[PDB]
Design a protein around this ligand. Structure first.
Ligand SMILES: [Ca+2]
Ligand SMILES: [Ca+2]
Lengths: 112, 495, 495
């Protein structure tokens, strides 16, 4: 009964395509016991996918990395007026690899 | 936790507020969920869970939006297709009714119970003018079940000196949950835990004139002559069950033949919902006793009314205290009722209910033939309608999907597969189209879902052949009914 | 004659009016008498005639004067010592209650019945804080009789799986007039015309612990084990009957011993009337089920509440629709109730009720010793009091004489010789003395009256000295005692 409710709750997640929801559905049919935890990490996974999307729309030139000006573009767009030094500090706080731009995870780390 | 004074003070502070910030909203929702869990009933929380998805089970009422909309504590607006199960016939906070209630509140809300209160006389006269035939005297109470209690007591006081004691009701009927009325109510689960109830109550199939004639004739043969027959003109909680044309006329003729009283329970069908002021006016049938409530309060006040002919009501003339009720006929309730009758007659809301009812039922029937996999049939009369589904789970998912689209619907107490549509008679045509479209999207989502399950239980296909089907279902959800077709088209070949 | 629309329109025109000219008043009083005669109950007209003299029987309510006064259609102001038989504990149109009701009216008067309504949770929490011991869960309805119905159904749902079905009530008790509650109510004339009622209801003398122990023990011996005992802490309708000290405690102990539930009916004694919030607090007794109504509405709304321990109330957790009611717990009624609890606690109206009650009962007892020819005894607790007279005619003339002095009093449903004094708890000391003085002039007029009749009926008297005797009786009332003696002094001397 609960394997089904899990099955539909994972199915209705807005930011997953068919292949992974199907894979998960397989994992859940084989294991009615590992449900709410599998369900949990699936939900989380949806969070990562949607985060990925929004992030992508924060990378104006689509080159997979975010610069101080792209940042700057969004910050200025949201009614703000950041300085070059402010943008550089923001990036420096999460720049794990010290290349001066923000990749995918580092952006997740900014959110965290 | 805290003292009663603190609790009351907090409650009044919250009554005086008109809007809530979100931390106010979250705190209040958390509070009401807690107090529902520990002081009202946790079962209700579980029920709404079964008719919602996620935190939708925890929507808290706040304020009426417009005539036909309700606004929760989060500002979400809902079109009300529930109408309080027939309460809000003239909409929410109807300006005329609110105005009358406000004026009489300025004057005097409750009566002394000793002196003559004028609005009781005015309302009794109005109801005498509004009811068919010889219905002349009115007794006022506060609820439908109380109105049915007064009806039963009138029948008993009239028929006991004539040697008649047994009452005939119908299966699937609902007449209230007070023990007297509960003896007439027919749903097993409502009655069994409180048996024994009143002696001499029998039930026959609804809409079956020969069964009822059989019951009356057998009761006469055995010396258990029937005092009264009680029925709804259309069974609300039974799933909006329509009797065959002429049934009410035949029941009246039968009661006249055996010398039994006819008690019509119009608590739900009354006040214009079925296209006329009372459902009994569809066949020009006058009962001996007529029961009213719900909509008679104009969606502002609680009220009930039991109207009877002078012939039967005269059993209370020698002793006017033989049947009373504490708050019955209070000036606030009477003001509400008079305002409601005025609104219904001036705007001809019964006829509107017939038109909008025909439109909504047309839409629902079209959706019914488009979705025979989910809908069994749609039925109704005026603005009292219902959609019966194939399962209870299906109708459950329908209620949930409609709630997600901010259209309010609910089930029926005696029918688990049926969802009622009982919107205000003031529902606009725009909102009619909106609710039809909402029903369409609901049924579409539900078809996708039932397809998604049925594809999972098919036995004759490998572990990865399903995953292609689920995948294609989710990221390309267009091959849907036809997709399910593909699934079985491989399952039956692989059988 | 006229259409329902015309009648309603006239009624709303009259709701909007605040005062009446003389000819509008005469027309309205004539109208209300007619419609009472032809559409409500003509018996009421005869009853009010039996408690009035002349056109006093035709006083029509109009508006609340102050907290403790009512104003009829002629502008006559009455001090309310009736209090709607225990409704107006916080006076008429209490500003706090009227304010809360108006605010919630501005938001939403009646709830959807589907979503969680917050004021029901708030009121349930408040009542849990306010009630003794483990009383925790509340069910809301619209009247006292409905509250008793819910109490009985809770007891049945709890005790039927344990093989217990019979209910014990007390003689002289009143618990409502719906058939379920009527099975517990004890007055013959209220019950006989509607028999058969619920099976397995028994009555024992009120205040007699050994009689009740006998009933429970015999019921156990014969296999008719008692499910619940229901009683008022003080019988209001029985004539304000006080049980011996410790009776309630002994009943609690007895129910604990036999495994029966204790249902306390505080519909009349509740909300501060007896000097404490609930009468059961005088002995610190917690029932299993507590019934509230009347005063819980603040004299503005109809409401009822059935509070129970989680142990008993849990019989509704698995199926929250097992017992419901159409309007129960609506936001307007809940707002009223919370306002009333706030007013009672903030102004400590229970203690005031004890003080003013002691004062009024002192006055009534003094008048009782001064008029033993008319008054048998005066009794009361807090502001629930009664005066029992020698006959019913005497108490009738008392009610009439108090009505002529514009002090409102009324009889008790189960006691024809008793007149109840149940004024608001907000009654001021000046009005207390005014009511005592009014009672004195009433009793004086009644004594002079009985003298006047006795002098009028002496057969051994010609017309001349009779005219002289009643002439003197009028011109010197204080000689009333002597001249009557003189009259018989002569009625014997020519026999
Ligand atoms: Ca970039
Ligand atoms: Ca980097």
């Amino acid at each position: 009964k609960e394997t089904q409710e899990a099955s539909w709750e994972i199915f209705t997640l807005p930011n997953l395509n068919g292949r992974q929801v199907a894979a998960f559905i397989s994992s859940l049919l084989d294991d009615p016991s590992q449900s709410a935890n599998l369900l949990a990490e699936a939900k989380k996974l949806n969070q990562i996918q949607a985060f990925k999307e929004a992030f992508s729309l924060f990378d104006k030139d689509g080159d997979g990395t975010i610069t101080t000006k792209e940042l700057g573009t969004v910050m200025r767009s949201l009614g703000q007026n950041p300085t070059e030094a402010e943008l550089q500090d923001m990036i420096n706080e999460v720049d794990a690899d010290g290349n001066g731009t923000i990749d995918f995870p580092e952006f997740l780390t900014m959110m965290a | 936790s805290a003292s009663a004074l603190a609790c009351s003070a907090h409650a009044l502070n919250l009554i005086e507020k008109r809007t809530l910030d979100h931390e106010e909203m979250k705190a209040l929702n958390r509070e009401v969920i807690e107090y529902f869990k520990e002081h009202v009933n946790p079962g209700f929380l579980e029920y709404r869970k079964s008719v919602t998805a996620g935190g939708d089970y925890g929507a808290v009422e706040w304020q009426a939006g417009s005539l036909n909309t309700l606004v929760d504590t989060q500002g979400q607006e809902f079109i009300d297709c529930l109408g309080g199960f027939g309460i809000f016939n003239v909409g929410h906070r109807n300006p005329v009714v609110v105005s009358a209630v406000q004026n009489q509140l300025a004057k005097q809300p409750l009566h002394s119970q000793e002196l003559l209160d004028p609005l009781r006389a005015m309302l009794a006269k109005t109801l005498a003018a509004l009811t068919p035939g010889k219905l002349k005297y009115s007794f006022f109470c506060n609820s439908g079940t109380e109105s049915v209690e007064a009806a039963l007591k009138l029948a008993k006081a009239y028929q006991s000196p004539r040697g008649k004691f047994t009452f005939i009701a119908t299966s699937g009927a609902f007449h209230g949950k007070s023990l007297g009325a509960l003896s007439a109510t027919a749903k097993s689960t409502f009655r069994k835990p409180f048996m024994p109830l009143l002696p001499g109550f029998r039930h026959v199939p609804f809409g079956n004139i020969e069964a009822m004639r059989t019951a009356l004739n057998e009761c006469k043969k055995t010396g258990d002559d029937v005092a009264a027959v009680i029925l709804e003109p259309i069974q609300g909680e039974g799933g909006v069950i329509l009797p065959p044309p002429g049934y009410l006329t035949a029941v009246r003729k039968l009661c006249d033949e055996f010398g039994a009283l006819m008690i019509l329970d119009e608590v739900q069908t009354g006040m214009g919902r079925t296209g006329k002021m009372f459902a009994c006016e569809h066949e020009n049938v006058q009962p001996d006793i007529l029961c009213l409530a719900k909509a008679l309060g104009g969606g502002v006040m609680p009220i009930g009314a039991t109207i009877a002919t002078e012939e039967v009501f005269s059993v209370l003339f020698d002793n006017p205290f033989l049947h009373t009720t504490t708050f019955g006929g209070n000036p606030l309730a009477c003001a509400a009722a008079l305002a409601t009758i005025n609104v219904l007659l001036e705007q001809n809301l019964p006829a509107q209910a017939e038109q909008k009812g025909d439109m909504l039922l047309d839409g629902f029937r079209q959706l019914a033939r488009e979705y025979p996999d989910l809908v069994q049939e749609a039925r109704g009369k005026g603005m009292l309608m219902a959609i019966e589904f194939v399962d209870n789970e299906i109708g459950y998912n329908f209620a949930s999907e409609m709630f997600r689209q901010r259209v309010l619907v609910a089930g029926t107490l005696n029918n688990a597969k049926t969802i009622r549509i009982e919107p205000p008679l003031t529902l606009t045509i725009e909102q009619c189209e909106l609710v039809i479209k909402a029903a369409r999207k609901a049924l579409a989502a539900m078809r996708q879902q039932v397809a998604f399950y049925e594809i999972l239980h098919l036995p004759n296909l490998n572990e990865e052949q399903r995953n292609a089907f689920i995948q294609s279902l989710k990221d390309d959800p267009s091959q849907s009914a036809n997709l399910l077709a593909e699934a079985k088209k491989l399952n039956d070949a692989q059988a």
